[PDB]
Amino acid sequence: MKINFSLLDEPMEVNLGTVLVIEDVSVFAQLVKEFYQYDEQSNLTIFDSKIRSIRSSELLLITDILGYDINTSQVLKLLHTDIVSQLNDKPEVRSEIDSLVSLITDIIMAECIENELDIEYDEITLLELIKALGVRIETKSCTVFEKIFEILQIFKYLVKKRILVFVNSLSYFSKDEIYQILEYTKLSQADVLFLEPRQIEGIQQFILDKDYILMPYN
Amino acid sequence: GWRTVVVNIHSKLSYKNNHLIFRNSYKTEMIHLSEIDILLLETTDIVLTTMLVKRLVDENILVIFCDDKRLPTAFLTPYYARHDSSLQIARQIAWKENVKCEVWTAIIAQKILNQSYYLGECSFFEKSQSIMELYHGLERFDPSNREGHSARIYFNTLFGNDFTRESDNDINAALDYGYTLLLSMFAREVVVCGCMTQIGLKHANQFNQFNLASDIMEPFRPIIDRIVYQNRHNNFVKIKKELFSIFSETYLYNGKEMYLSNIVSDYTKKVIKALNQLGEEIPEFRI
Amino acid sequence: GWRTVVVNIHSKLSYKNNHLIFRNSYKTEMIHLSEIDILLLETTDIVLTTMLVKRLVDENILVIFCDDKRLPTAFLTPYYARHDSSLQIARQIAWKENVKCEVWTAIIAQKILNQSYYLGECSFFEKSQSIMELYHGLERFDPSNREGHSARIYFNTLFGNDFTRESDNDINAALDYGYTLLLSMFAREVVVCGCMTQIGLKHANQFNQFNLASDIMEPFRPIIDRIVYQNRHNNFVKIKKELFSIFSETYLYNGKEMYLSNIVSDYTKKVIKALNQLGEEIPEFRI
Amino acid sequence: GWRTVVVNIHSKLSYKNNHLIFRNSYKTEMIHLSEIDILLLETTDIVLTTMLVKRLVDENILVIFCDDKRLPTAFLTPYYARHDSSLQIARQIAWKENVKCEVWTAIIAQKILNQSYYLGECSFFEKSQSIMELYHGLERFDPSNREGHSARIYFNTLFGNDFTRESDNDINAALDYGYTLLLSMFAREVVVCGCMTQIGLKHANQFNQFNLASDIMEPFRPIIDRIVYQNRHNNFVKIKKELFSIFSETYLYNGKEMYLSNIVSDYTKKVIKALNQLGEEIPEFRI
Amino acid sequence: MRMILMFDMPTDTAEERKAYRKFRKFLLSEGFIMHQFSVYSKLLLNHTANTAMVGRLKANNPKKGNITILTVTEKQFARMIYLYGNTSIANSEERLVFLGDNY
Amino acid sequence: MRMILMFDMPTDTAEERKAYRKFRKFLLSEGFIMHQFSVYSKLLLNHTANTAMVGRLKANNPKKGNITILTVTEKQFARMIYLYGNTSIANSEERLVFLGDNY
Amino acid sequence: MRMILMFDMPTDTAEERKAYRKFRKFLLSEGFIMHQFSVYSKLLLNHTANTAMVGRLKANNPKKGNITILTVTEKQFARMIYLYGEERLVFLGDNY
């Protein structure tokens, strides 16, 4: 994947982990504004290997790592649908689940018939059992280093998002933690792009000078 | 590394921040990569990631896969920076015939001694005294065949004179089942040692592929015949249920009371180290 | 199996009803195991189950695990492919240095002859005549090192005098890649034969697990050298794809035109049979 | 076969791949032969092939051919249903008049008892008296003709004193229709047994091909009399449809609840076995 | 080998409808019979004729056209049920079957 | 038993489209997966579940709706080829198979 | 009556761990709260409920499981104090 703006001479490719440093505060703030306004503004563009423009729905932009909720309505919907598909791939297990649900429905139905008030029921479904169990991704994160790892896991799980972008998220992690994040990104194959106001020493990064010239580093 | 990580339960494995993440339904455990030495997977329900496999290739740790029978099937072979076990197999190819005959004779002596001692616990003095006489009469190269002669006395004492190993019965199938479980455990220990199980201690018969582990598991064999003697009236399913409790039951090692897995592990390690060092000490196990 | 399945994409693999199940968010596809020969995982984001690994070991399918760079990292080696392995180990230990040096010398003669045939097809009379002179000058124990000289003159004539095998260029990278793939297939064939892969037929001092499979894979190197010579101007990715096209292409064996996997299997079978029978017939492969 | 296929429409029938092929201009449908028990052609515009007739003879499927009035005209009788027929002919010629008169007397007693049970269930009382007392009064050779008197009192009590069996009314027409269908099924069962259908168990002077099948079908007449009594007000077409619903309905045999075809087959089997074994057990069918 | 073939394609445009008629006529000319809308089948003699038929179907497929090909035995073909909101009789286990007046 | 199900019905009216959406949602809720337009399949555990599923499908069929049910083995299901005017890979005999970049 | 309950058992085997989880879930379902590992308490209304609870605990005790039961007053139950954590050489740093 490649990103292109009017400041660059040629579009630079983003593969696996990528660190982009902008030495101009105006170009950095205007670039983040172009990231949040990407749907509104046509200046900033992104061309994949197919050389096709992507909608903002396919771009995942995350600034605050701790403030980003892992559990969402769409994420829980895709997770519950995934578990329902996994249970549907095995006929015998789903048959046993239908038998147990039939037994529980028979017991609760008998208790309802024992009551003096009329009771009407419909049925119990596997999706209602998963939602009743509260299946969700683990919400336990001790540090931002683990939270960003969970963000990379959910990002690699989401097929619709073709790119994940972090804005000034590298200032929290130590150099060694940055090395572990880059190695985990290379192992996960996902495309991650970082935007930093200042350069980081010891790691390979693309430095954008105030002259607008882009140069590789390490 | 030092600790040997073995997974007997359903679980998933991941690699994050130089940390192996093992996730099971009960709890999640994170283990440092430098602490792990050998990795073994007991069951077929374990899930692993190719990234963790690559990290294991960089860490040189040996990956062992097993089938539903728990017998080790395949192992991970890296193209570079190979593990030291592959260098240790050459010593197994260099094992001398004198050391193999000494360890084999010691193993047969331990098994026969355990059979006679078990017959003494069953309060048959004549049969246990005969098996003990055959134990004191055992010699190298086995010209007397006192092991095959002690067999018929042991089985005839246990299950009666009418019973035999050749006949088809739930008792013989139970004995083959217990020998299959013990062969799986000892074979897993030999696979952990890295030595090829196709090379046996017995020089006569190479037919079996498990010959090394089958020869190492002989001193622990009578412990199965005891439970098979107590439960002999029960159906083969009940005999399998009783034989399945041997993993939970604890036995007395010479040093201390231990589980069967640790005892078989220490015995196998002493056997391999003794074979490579040419008979420093022979591990002895008594019921 | 006839089919080489390469997975470069993140997905989950399961085993259902004797069928390999490829599950992804975009699509799911099922491929039968009997049609699958080799399984290649080119990325670290692929997930697999130990049950599918056990079914692959029972199906005798080579599983290759690559790195993030896509270069192969580690391949799965089954402990027991067939019961004839334990019986073949005694024959491998009983092999003679005359049979090993003879078969290895004939194999090196076939490799140098294949290089002279490649230079002859490339219309170099002096280079193929010199390599043919080294082929006629090859002797036991290799005192003149005519094989290494044939390789140095081969690569130096093909890629230029400034080229060398110790260079880090993508040419040597693709050469080591093709040698790693062919070494993986030949090593899997040696695992099918059951003989020890660590024991070489040339130098008993050199200890490597890939030595034997390399000695068996020596005559087939020029096939990789041809595509490497044609695609040398292309990028390493296209060169890797053209290297993957070798499995689809067919080559002419002395008997008839066959696939590369069948030629390697039958060639390794004739090599093992010739080693056990002490040089009854030597299989010859020509371009 | 379990299925009664009735074709009232013009069409062509062929036999393809062990499948009955129904071909018409509007639609085409294929029905397997193993599921098909009885084939009924209710019109004269149906076309069939002699190959399908041969496949129906090999499948032992009863084929009935009706007239333009839809009343059954002629049914197909196979020459050899099974090899046991030629051996059963000698037994039928060796039968005794005591066994024939005994089995026929017991069958007539079962029919009169079923009529008394029908009147008892219909709550027709003193009619069930005359039927019951006639049943207790039935004797060998039938000198009192209590069977014909039981039939006359049965129909005269059910349909009224002015009713008679010799009338041309649609009641007697439906009675003869049901007797023709049940006589066709029972005759087909006698063809399956192999014994001669023309030889009766009651009167040796009366010569008819349907005599034996009528003697076997005597106890089941009241089942037709019930639906004929209920639908007597309905038109002859609806009465014929309700008569066709008897094949779908199930009846309770002494052993368990079974279909009419299975009860007729097992009943005829027990009757033939009782005739060959000289009255070992007499099957009894009750409503 | 019993070849079951489903055919779908956007019919909105006139060119698409003409292509659909042409493809259907091509299917009828090749021996395929239409059981219902988009539903067709043909009996192939062997695997070679099946492969050649697959290549021909790929060559004659219209733009935007989609064709599903499945291989089925005669026993599965006789077990085929068609329900028109009225279900096929072959799937029914009913004892009595009337081709005629159902009364 | 592998249950292949085709679904067609006139979509012109709004009520017909609503009925089509309802029937499709009912098929998804019952465990059926849509391979393509009008094409669906579900794995039934045994013959009893297959019969009950047939009755349920007959009960839930919309007005004018038409559904084709066929019984297929796993070997025939893996042999299913789907050609979009792009063909299914399982029918292809190609030696090398790339899930990834085709280069 | 305030019931203080201690629970211990060998956890080594998998069956023993499963039995421990089952017994703990049974204690939570009966109204007992875990102040710490092996440490639990529950407020019993009277002596009858205490006796019935003793019988139920004896019935639900896992194999090799050991339970210690002590009666404490409600005011003494509130008096429960939970503490959660002389060297010559004190080392702040690497412990060598």
Swiss-Prot record, chain A:
A GO BP term here is:
defense response to virus
Q: Which UniProt keywords apply?
A: Antiviral defense, Calcium, DNA-binding, Metal-binding
Does the keyword DNA-binding feature in the UniProt annotation?
yes
Q: Does the keyword DNA-binding apply?
A: yes
Q: What happens when the gene is disrupted?
A: Plasmid transformation is still inhibited.
> Mind listing the GO molecular function terms for this protein?
DNA binding; metal ion binding
Residues binding Ca(2+), per UniProt: 138, 150
Q: Which cofactor does it need?
A: Ca(2+)
What job does this protein perform? CRISPR (clustered regularly interspaced short palindromic repeat) is an adaptive immune system that provides protection against mobile genetic elements (viruses, transposable elements and conjugative plasmids). CRISPR clusters contain spacers, sequences complementary to antecedent mobile elements, and target invading nucleic acids. CRISPR clusters are transcribed and processed into CRISPR RNA (crRNA). Binds dsDNA. When the CRISPR3/cas system consisting of cas9-cas1-cas2-csn2-CRISPR3 or just cas9-CRISPR3 is expressed in E.coli it prevents plasmids homologous to spacers 1 or 2 from transforming.
Note the subunit structure: Homotetramer.
The cross-references to NCBIfam families, in alphabetical order and at most eight, read: cas_Csn2
Regarding protein family, the annotation reads: Belongs to the CRISPR-associated Csn2 protein family.
Q: What is this protein called?
A: CRISPR-associated protein Csn2
UniProtKB/Swiss-Prot annotation, chains B, C, D:
Look at the named UniProt entry and state the broad enzyme category this protein falls under.
hydrolase
Among InterPro entries, the record links this protein to: Cas1 (IPR050646), CRISPR-assoc_Cas1 (IPR002729), CRISPR-assoc_Cas1_C (IPR042206), CRISPR-assoc_Cas1_NMENI (IPR019855)
Result of knocking out the encoding gene: Plasmid transformation is still inhibited.
- Source species, domain of life: Bacteria
Q: Which cofactor does it need?
A: Mg(2+); Mn(2+)
The answer, when asked if Metal-binding is one of the entry's keywords, is yes
Which keywords does this chain's UniProt record carry? Answer: Antiviral defense, DNA-binding, Endonuclease, Hydrolase, Magnesium, Manganese, Metal-binding, Nuclease
What are its E.C. numbers?
3.1.-.-
Q: Where does Mn(2+) bind?
A: 147, 203, 218
Q: Name one Pfam family in it.
A: Cas_Cas1
* Cysteine pairings via disulfide bonds: none
Q: Name one GO molecular function term.
A: DNA binding
From its record, what is one biological process in GO terms?
defense response to virus
Q: State the family named in the UniProt similarity comment for this chain.
A: Belongs to the CRISPR-associated endonuclease Cas1 family.
Name the HAMAP family on file.
Answer: Cas1
Function of the molecule = CRISPR (clustered regularly interspaced short palindromic repeat), is an adaptive immune system that provides protection against mobile genetic elements (viruses, transposable elements and conjugative plasmids). CRISPR clusters contain spacers, sequences complementary to antecedent mobile elements, and target invading nucleic acids. CRISPR clusters are transcribed and processed into CRISPR RNA (crRNA). Acts as a dsDNA endonuclease. Involved in the integration of spacer DNA into the CRISPR cassette.
Note the subunit structure: Homodimer, forms a heterotetramer with a Cas2 homodimer.
Record protein name field = CRISPR-associated endonuclease Cas1
Q: Which organism is it from?
A: Streptococcus thermophilus
UniProtKB/Swiss-Prot annotation, chains E, F:
Name the UniProt key words of this record, in alphabetical order: Antiviral defense, Endonuclease, Hydrolase, Magnesium, Metal-binding, Nuclease
What biological-process terms (Gene Ontology) are attached? defense response to virus; maintenance of CRISPR repeat elements
Q: Which Pfam families match?
A: CRISPR_Cas2
Q: Which Gene3D superfamilies match?
A: 3.30.70.240
Q: List the disulfide bonds.
A: none
What cofactors are annotated for this protein?
Mg(2+)
Q: What class of enzyme is it?
A: hydrolase
Q: What stretch or stretches form a coiled coil here?
A: none
Residues annotated for Mg(2+) binding in this entry: 8
Q: What is its EC number?
A: 3.1.-.-
Q: Which CDD domains match?
A: Cas2_I_II_III
Matching InterPro entries, A to Z? Answer: CRISPR_associated_Cas2, Virulence_VapD/CRISPR_Cas2
Instruction: Respond yes or no to whether keyword Magnesium is given for this record.
Output: yes
Knockout-associated phenotype: Plasmid transformation is still inhibited.
A GO molecular-function descriptor: RNA endonuclease activity
General function of this protein: CRISPR (clustered regularly interspaced short palindromic repeat), is an adaptive immune system that provides protection against mobile genetic elements (viruses, transposable elements and conjugative plasmids). CRISPR clusters contain spacers, sequences complementary to antecedent mobile elements, and target invading nucleic acids. CRISPR clusters are transcribed and processed into CRISPR RNA (crRNA). Functions as a ssRNA-specific endoribonuclease. Involved in the integration of spacer DNA into the CRISPR cassette. When the CRISPR3/cas system consisting of cas9-cas1-cas2-csn2-CRISPR3 or just cas9-CRISPR3 is expressed in E.coli it prevents plasmids homologous to spacers 1 or 2 from transforming.
HAMAP family listed in its UniProt record: Cas2 (MF_01471)
Subunit: Homodimer, forms a heterotetramer with a Cas1 homodimer.
Q: Which family does it belong to?
A: Belongs to the CRISPR-associated endoribonuclease Cas2 protein family.
* The protein, known as: CRISPR-associated endoribonuclease Cas2
- Species of origin reads Streptococcus thermophilus
The UniProt gene name for this protein comes to: cas2
From Swiss-Prot, chain G:
This entry's Gene Ontology molecular function terms read: metal ion binding; RNA endonuclease activity
In the UniProt record for this chain, what is stated about the effect of gene disruption?
Plasmid transformation is still inhibited.
E.C. number(s) listed in UniProt: 3.1.-.-
Record key words, sorted = Antiviral defense, Endonuclease, Hydrolase, Magnesium, Metal-binding, Nuclease
Q: What is the enzyme's main class? A: hydrolase
One GO biological process term is: defense response to virus
Enumerate the InterPro entries for this protein.
CRISPR_associated_Cas2 (IPR021127), Virulence_VapD/CRISPR_Cas2 (IPR019199)
The keyword Metal-binding belongs to this UniProt entry's keyword annotation: yes
| Required cofactor names | Mg(2+)
Q: Which residues cross the membrane?
A: none
Q: Which amino acid positions bind Mg(2+), per UniProt?
A: 8
Q: Which domain of life is it from?
A: Bacteria
What binding partners and quaternary form does the record give?
Homodimer, forms a heterotetramer with a Cas1 homodimer.
Q: Which family does it belong to?
A: Belongs to the CRISPR-associated endoribonuclease Cas2 protein family.
Protein function: CRISPR (clustered regularly interspaced short palindromic repeat), is an adaptive immune system that provides protection against mobile genetic elements (viruses, transposable elements and conjugative plasmids). CRISPR clusters contain spacers, sequences complementary to antecedent mobile elements, and target invading nucleic acids. CRISPR clusters are transcribed and processed into CRISPR RNA (crRNA). Functions as a ssRNA-specific endoribonuclease. Involved in the integration of spacer DNA into the CRISPR cassette.
Q: What is this protein called?
A: CRISPR-associated endoribonuclease Cas2
Species for this entry: Streptococcus thermophilus
